[PDB]
DNA sequence: AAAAATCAA
């Protein structure tokens, strides 16, 4: 059924480090020293565990990348927090417009607490430094807003024998708040049929993205 | 049976 296809599809899209992943608890994350499995993903989808994925494979390539638009911590508790909610969507729309201009297919996710991820998926892994560079240059094009932080995963160009950074992946439960992390549309409205959205997500071409790095870098 | 908690920039 569609939900079973979603299990296999999730594993292909959020494919990072081969042999380590992460789970969220209340106050941190913890590495799990083995490959992610189907049972891990069923536990993600049901709320029994919350998965985070290390983006960098052992050869310092990534199969996906993400912007992380956040409300700054000290803006969170304000009574006019709705302003910085708007601002976070303003910054996300600007980034997305640039990404569309570069024909980079991407998807929005409400992260279950204080912001949004913009997910970028690749059919074949690409060098972590190349996508990171593209994402940094695109950020350098847009106006920012007060109280918003934009973060770029991958955070590393290379592991140097380490794990790198991980990102909490969608369709799970945010352990800081108990709310589902869900895909949203271009207007930030929650998609009703998440499973089907997941099964329609498209991968960018590594060949195109590789060409785009040389192009932006202008050699 | 449940409490405890990693790893990075
Ligand atoms: N790897 C790792 N990254 C972190 C950790 N804490 C924060 N970050 C990252 O740093 C960014 C800034 O978040 P902050 O809210 O300022 O994090 P903090 O200063 O440690 O305080 P809290 O997250 O509220 O506990 C986050 O979006 C995360 O990407 C951590 O303990 N380990
Ligand atoms: N203590 C920690 N240890 C290891 N990795 C962590 C971490 N904290 C975060 N990360 C990783 C996983 C995280 O996904 C990412 C930074 O995300 P955040 O901005 O802190 N939280 P998110 O974007 O997921 O949702 P929202 O912002 O609404 O709270 O770095
Ligand atoms: N004076 C005003 N006039 C019209 N709409 C207003 C408004 N004040 C607030 N709105 C609201 C009601 C409108 O339905 C909503 C639309 O604003 P976006 O969705 O941010 N931008 P757009 O839809 O034009 O396209 P894209 O997202 O691709 O950029 O703003
Ligand atoms: Co911290
Ligand atoms: Co962040
Ligand atoms: Co965030
Ligand atoms: Co709109």
CA distance A11 to A21: 12
Alpha helices, DSSP H only, in A116-170? Answer: 128-139
Burial (CB count within 10 angstroms: exposed 0-12, middle 13-18, buried 19+), residue A152: middle
Q: In what order do the strands lie in the sheet with A61-71?
A: A148-153, A61-71, A115-127, A106-110, A182-184
CA quadruple A93, A81, A183, A163: dihedral sign: positive
- Please tell me the distance between residue A96's alpha carbon and the centre of ligand 5 in angstroms: 17
**Declared resolution, Å:** 2.1
| Domain made up of A2-217: CATH architecture | Alpha-Beta Complex (3.90)
Alpha helices, DSSP H only, in A70-170? Answer: 81-101, 128-139
C-alpha A187 chain-centroid distance: 18
Cβ contacts of A15 within 8 Å, gap of 6 or more: A63, A64
List bases, strand B, within 7 Å of protein CB.
4-9
Question: Which ligand 2 atom lies nearest to the CA of residue A177?
Answer: 29
Residue with tokens 């160009």: A157
State the structure-solving technique.
X-ray
- H-run or E-run covering A10: helix A2-13
Residue A64 CB coordination number (10 Å)? 23
Helix, strand and coil content of chain A, in percent to the nearest 5, comes to 35, 25, 40
Question: What's the Å distance between residue A77 CA and nucleotide B1 C1'?
Answer: 36
Report DSSP letters for A25-81, one per residue: ETTEEEEESS---HHHHHHHHHTS--EEEE---TTSEEEEEEEEEEE-GGGTT-TTH
Q: Mutate which of A81, A167, A182 to test ligand 2's pocket (most atoms within 8 Å of Cβ)? A: A167
Token output for A166: 């991980």
Q: Is A103 left (phi over 0), alpha (psi -120 to 50) or beta?
A: left
Question: What's the Å distance between residue A32 CA and nucleotide B4 C1'?
Answer: 14
Q: Decide: A165 and A137 in contact? Cβ < 8 Å.
A: no
With a 6 A CB cut-off, is A168 part of the ligand 2 pocket?
A: yes
Q: Decide: A50 and A174 in contact? Cβ < 8 Å.
A: yes
Residue A91's nearest CA partner among A174, A132, A152 is: A152
CA distance A108 to A128: 21
Token output for A124: 């074949």
A80 φ, ψ to 5°? Answer: -95, 40
Cβ contacts of A162 within 8 Å, gap of 6 or more: none
């Amino acid at each position: 059924g569609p939900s079973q296809n979603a299990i296999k599809r999730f594993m292909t899209l959020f494919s990072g480090r081969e042999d380590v992943f992460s789970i969220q608890y209340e106050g941190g994350y913890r590495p799990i020293r083995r490959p992610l499995n189907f049972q891990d993903i069923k536990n993600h989808f049901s709320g029994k565990k919350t998965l985070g994925i290390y983006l960098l494979k052992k050869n310092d390539t990534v199969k996906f990348a993400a912007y992380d638009i956040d409300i700054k911590k000290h803006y969170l508790n304000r009574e006019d927090k709705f302003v910085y909610e708007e601002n976070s969507k303003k910054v996300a729309k600007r980034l997305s417009r640039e990404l569309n201009l570069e024909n980079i297919t991407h998807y929005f996710e409400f992260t279950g607490n204080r912001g949004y991820h913009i997910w970028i998926f690749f059919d074949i892994p690409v060098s972590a430094y190349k996508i990171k560079y593209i994402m940094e240059k695109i950020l350098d094009r847009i106006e920012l807003e007060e109280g918003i932080d934009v973060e770029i995963f991958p955070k590393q160009t290379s592991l140097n024998g380490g794990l790198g950074n991980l990102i909490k992946v969608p369709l799970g439960v945010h352990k800081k708040t108990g709310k589902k992390c869900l895909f949203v549309d271009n207007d930030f409205n929650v998609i009703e049929n998440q499973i089907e959205f997941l099964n329609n997500i498209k991968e960018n071409k590594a060949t195109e993205i590789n060409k785009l790095f040389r192009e932006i870098f202008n050699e």
